[PDB]
């Protein structure tokens, strides 16, 4: 989830944005 | 400014800025 691949790692743009509604 | 560990209210923050009138959706346990 975005705990494990935002916090415990590098975020990135691609990844942030699948968070977005 | 999103390429870096972002935790707690630092990734909400990035979220926010990223997303803008779209929204977005934080599941920290799943």
């Known amino acids: 989830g975005i705990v494990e691949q935002c916090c415990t790692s590098i975020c990135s743009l691609y990844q942030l944005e699948n968070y977005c509604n | 400014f999103v390429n870096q560990?972002?935790?707690?209210?630092?990734?909400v923050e990035a979220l926010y800025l990223v997303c803008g009138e779209r929204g977005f959706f934080y599941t920290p346990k799943a």
Do not use: V
Not at chain 2, 5 to 11: I, K, P, T, Y
């Open chain 2, 5 to 11: 560990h972002l935790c707690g209210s630092h990734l």
